[PDB]
Design a protein around this ligand. Structure first.
Ligand SMILES: *[C@@H]1O[C@H](CO)[C@@H](O[C@@H]2O[C@H](CO)[C@@H](O)[C@H](O)[C@H]2NC(C)=O)[C@H](O)[C@H]1NC(C)=O
Length: 361
């Protein structure tokens, strides 16, 4: 089984214990670690943070302790305008230029592959995405002729039905990608008057309008579109989404007035790292959606939808029963990486729980 873990560049700037550098990553924890967000300048892949070359080096040294560890660099991300990806891919000259610049860059900094994070191709981009994936892979095959181990190619793909039908030709890109990470944790998100969980595993006999917004549906749909199971990777979040209640109501459908207040360390409205949630729980009321199989918590006028060891182990048993290639975890830096916030002096509790299940069978 594969355990793909993302590390984000900007996590280095969080204060105090929130600060996270690649050197805090357990070499034997994941099978693949993806460094988050390289940019594109002059139509060529390029660094993002002023100290990326130093962190690339710090990350790739983990391979000295664990020889089998693979690393990849992800291009794009949320702060990268989709429009920008759209312009690169649309013109063969710009696309070829970007493609030809990747292997050398990757080889220089010691990466084993490229992860594409075009966060949301539109109806007009579908055809160019296919082209980009095909040509990129073809270039990686040619490059391997030089006697060095072929570069890996992966992509982070939306798990939203409408999004999938709009910009992805799954049957086509699946045959060129080594693996596909399903972003099965964005099924709700401060943008509609109510409270709801963003990463439910199951539909939940309760509501019906959105029978599509759960991991189970996303997975079945991909398999139906032609994506081989042995190439699918289910995303498991290590963070939570917070809301500010509009009333004293906490149950399903409770009104919302906006995202929850920022965490002491992540300082981003609507989000909380697992380690900030562990602190949040003291004095909070905990609950669990039976049907969706995920928990949530409330305190004062704050409502949090998150994942704990049990929900995460559950999602992992599930991907196993469906024979998928493995799991993807978004943000090692959002997990209790120091292991000093969540009681048990265990480092990376959420990620470890996933790893344990994957190792049982
Ligand atoms: C990534 O590279 C792009 C393009 O080289 C950067 O964007 C430019 O930033 C300058 C100064 O902020 C602007 O004058 C240009 O108009 C921008 N170009 C585009 C297409 O947006 C960007 O600064 C780089 N990213 C980072 C974080 O370094």
């Amino acid at each position: 089984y594969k355990l793909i873990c993302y590390y984000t560049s900007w996590s280095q700037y969080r204060e105090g214990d929130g600060s996270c550098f690649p050197d805090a990553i357990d070499p034997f924890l994941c099978t693949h670690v993806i460094y988050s967000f390289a940019n594109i300048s002059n139509n060529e892949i390029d660094t993002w943070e002023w100290n990326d070359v130093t962190l690339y080096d710090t990350l790739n040294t983990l391979k000295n302790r664990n020889p089998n560890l693979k690393t990849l660099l992800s291009v794009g991300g949320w702060n990268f305008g989709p429009q920008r990806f759209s312009k690169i891919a649309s013109k063969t000259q710009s696309r070829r230029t970007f493609i030809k610049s990747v292997p050398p860059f990757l080889r220089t900094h010691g990466f084993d592959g490229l992860d594409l994070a075009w966060l949301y191709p539109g109806r007009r981009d579908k055809r160019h995405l296919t082209t980009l994936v095909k040509e990129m892979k073809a270039e990686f095959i040619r490059e391997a002729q030089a006697g060095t181990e072929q570069l890996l190619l992966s992509a982070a793909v939306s798990a939203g039905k409408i999004a999938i039908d709009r910009g992805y030709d799954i049957a086509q890109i699946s045959r060129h990608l080594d693996f596909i990470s399903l972003l099965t944790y964005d099924f709700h998100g401060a943008w509609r008057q109510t409270v709801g969980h963003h990463s439910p595993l199951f539909r939940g006999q309760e509501d019906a309008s959105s029978r599509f917004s759960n991991a189970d549906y996303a997975v079945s749909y991909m398999l139906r579109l032609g994506a081989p199971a042995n190439k699918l990777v289910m995303g498991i979040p290590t963070f939570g989404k917070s809301f500010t209640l509009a009333s004293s109501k906490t149950d399903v459908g409770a009104p919302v007035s906006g995202p929850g207040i920022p965490g002491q360390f992540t300082k981003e409205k609507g989000i909380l790292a697992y380690y900030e949630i562990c602190d949040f729980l003291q004095g909070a009321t905990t609950h669990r959606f039976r049907d969706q199989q995920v928990p949530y918590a409330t305190k004062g006028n704050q409502w949090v939808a998150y994942d704990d060891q049990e929900s995460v182990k559950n999602k992992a048993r599930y991907l196993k029963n469906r024979q998928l290639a493995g799991a993807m975890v978004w943000a090692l830096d959002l997990d209790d990486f120091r292991g000093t916030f969540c009681g048990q002096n265990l480092t990376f509790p959420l990620t470890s729980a996933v790893k344990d299940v994957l190792a049982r069978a």
